């Protein structure tokens, strides 16, 4: 009464005959057009589909190194499946339930931020942030100048370059970027929001792709020129030590802390402190500060801090490929890229991203940060689109541990862009 | 004084929990909370934590009623009844439970983790003796339940649905909860009317399963031929462990258990909806198909022992770290307080006790015929079915001083518990057909 025994070769921990069973199930669901629009239905598809295009992206000879590898193959194959029509409407719905309705994206980011920040030493927190802010500024200045120089060459005035190209790309992505950008444009120029948003969303999305490619490239550069890489680390020589016994309970507390620290940040940002100075504070920017305060407070035992890291490790190593399926489906839209895929737009955007890379490399190097991780966090993770872009880039360069800096770039840096945007939109 | 701040609420030291509690209070009074997985889990973690810890430390509650999970769903139901929850808080819990369907995932994980945790060889050996002995206990509990039900003027369909099947089910979250979904899927009636009655009868029966366990031991000493004190069979002559070599255990294997849980559900879902939506006139619910599927997956040997252990680890995480979250949801979506109180009847106590008796009569007879000792059989295949899942097994075996039979009680709670889900689907469907 035995069909088989386990084979040798594994796909996502699953030997071929076992993965076959899973794949067949997904094929049955597909052809019979039957899948629950749930976490169960979503995760079922996302796991199985993520598993196959992950192992392929991990083994594709030229692709794995200079393109982001496994997560980028998944990210692109899934985006293609939507564009082509290979996905059922309800398969799309199932993935959308997970990523947007259930908000697995926010859960994913919140778990990672909590694991990253609670794992660091208290004395190290405030100093990193103080050195990270001017590093962001250099990336903006770098992205601006490169976009202007490439702008005038194509016969593009300064305004169109800053308003339609630089700011959307360097802004906080979609919801907290192109959308409030679309407001200010309409709230000043008086034109339609759609004419700005449609252009902005298409431009920054192209730049997002380049930021993903460049991330994989900068990872290679850092192995070629070791002196430039922190090999994951951003701060020079930086990371209660008593790693006690660790139970499932302490890992569960990590999820308690991740969701609770988000909840507090949500309340503060939506009801208590929506804007400090002229700058608005996204709830993920508030969450970074809250987790930092929770670290500095001393309220978390090192076994609980270890639990938050262990959960963050489960997510980033076991649910990453699932997430990339959802991000490829929900936050790409290949058509909007192609409808704007003018090799004038491609060049301006790509150069602007390079401008952010160069500026942030220069900035952090002056600060005392590693040149490679400076251009990825304060450069690429500004020129990408929000948290979805942060997870694409950091997975492509295999630096998911830098999620907190990336979020400071996406949220706090994107809010800074908003201020600049309000000015540039006003004067001219 | 400093002794106090060392006290833990769900793994959180008292000052750290206060932070989490203050956070929930601020969200409540500013009326601000995301109605997604983040806001929901935060609410359900914090709320489940405090009332779970209170539930554990109330004497009659922990020993008789069910402790933490019971206190949680009762209090969460009270928050709805008394309008303590805001609308957003109710939306957040409901969205997690039904819209995101964290309930199906939870049940999918439990079923997968429980059945795959079973040794393959032991699984097949059970089909020749121990599983039939389990079936006899269900038949026994059925016959006794119908009769006592009749004497009280309770129809057969209600006795089977609200009394017998929950009692012989795999407890609360592994029995009454998935039984409510199957009921609602076949009947069309609210799951709240099923669960609220089922969980009360469950709790009463579990008490009698413990009391009878002690009695069966006292009987086993007086009638020594019934006992074979300690052992179930007559040949093995050694109890400790016989294993499948499980070595490495990483996050990858537990994540595979998540793949298997979510994929085995998908297969059971397609079968129930598009492939085999009705064998006979009987519609088999996907929870029932999943039991058969997951049991089959174990039989095929396709899964490595390291992956089986990964499924069990994920199952253990959900059942010990996420159960208190689920019970907040259970109280909000499955609980009618009046239906529970109305079920707390001396009549229901009597019916419950006799159903449990029927389980020990059925399992003794059927076990006597197969080659098992009557006393132990009635304890392992009778009482450890009639009790409240794994927690009940520990209470029952403690009362009869037979913790060595724990492997057999595990088969009852897991295999026989999923089998009840299959029987229930078949029985529920047959009852609505005219
Ligand atoms: C390995 C995958 C085998 C797939 C076999 C099932 C093929 C689908 O089967 C059919 O799909 C039709 C839609 O095209 C439906 O209308 C039918 O109800 C269904 O039977
Ligand atoms: C306001 C507080 C700012 C927090 C900055 C991010 C800290 C969490 O990020 C951590 O940074 C560490 C050193 O910087 C690195 O060693 C870790 O890999 C990274 O996870
Ligand atoms: C007499 C009018 C019909 C009965 C109205 C009261 C029904 C219960 O309604 C309300 O339930 C909640 C729980 O106590 C509380 O908010 C109120 O005290 C109670 O009035
Ligand atoms: C939707 C919640 C995802 C569950 C993740 C469980 C992580 C358990 C880690 C066990 C080592
Ligand atoms: Cl709100
Ligand atoms: Cl309200
Ligand atoms: Na951006
Ligand atoms: Na970003
Ligand atoms: Na039971
Ligand atoms: Na049991």
Numbering used by the authors:
A (entry chain C): 13 to 251, 257 to 445
B (entry chain D): 15 to 448
Copy text from the publication.
In membrane vesicles and proteoliposomes, CitS from Klebsiella pneumoniae (KpCitS) was previously shown to transport citrate as HCit2- in a sodium-dependent manner. We observed similar transport properties for CitS from Salmonella enterica (SeCitS), which is closely related to KpCitS. Sodium transport is cooperative with a Hill coefficient of 1.89, whereas citrate is not, suggesting that citrate transport is coupled to at least two Na+ ions.
The asymmetric unit contains two homodimers of two protomers in different conformations. Each protomer has 13 helix elements (H1–H13), including eleven transmembrane helices (TMH) and two helix hairpins (H6, H12), with the N-terminus on the cytoplasmic side and the C-terminus on the outside. Helices H2-–7 and H8–13 are organized in two repeats with inverted topology, connected by a flexible cytoplasmic loop. Together, helices H5–7 of repeat 1 and H11–13 of repeat 2 form a bundle on either side of the central contact domains, which hold the dimer together through extensive hydrophobic interactions of H2, 4, 8 and 10. The two dimers in the asymmetric unit are similar, with an overall rmsd of 0.5 Å, whereas the protomers within one dimer differ substantially by an rmsd of 8.4 Å. Evidently, the whole bundle moves as a rigid body from its position in protomer A to that in protomer B, while the central dimer contact domain remains static. We conclude that protomer A is outward-facing and that protomer B faces inward. All four protomers show clear electron density for citrate in the binding site. In the outward-facing protomers, the citrate is closely coordinated by two arginines (Arg402, Arg428), two polar sidechains (Asn186, Ser405) and the protein backbone of both hairpins. In both outward-facing protomers, two Na+ ions are clearly resolved next to the citrate. In the case of SeCitS, comparison of the inward-facing protomers B and B’ indicates unambiguously that citrate is released before Na+, and that Na2 is released before Na1.
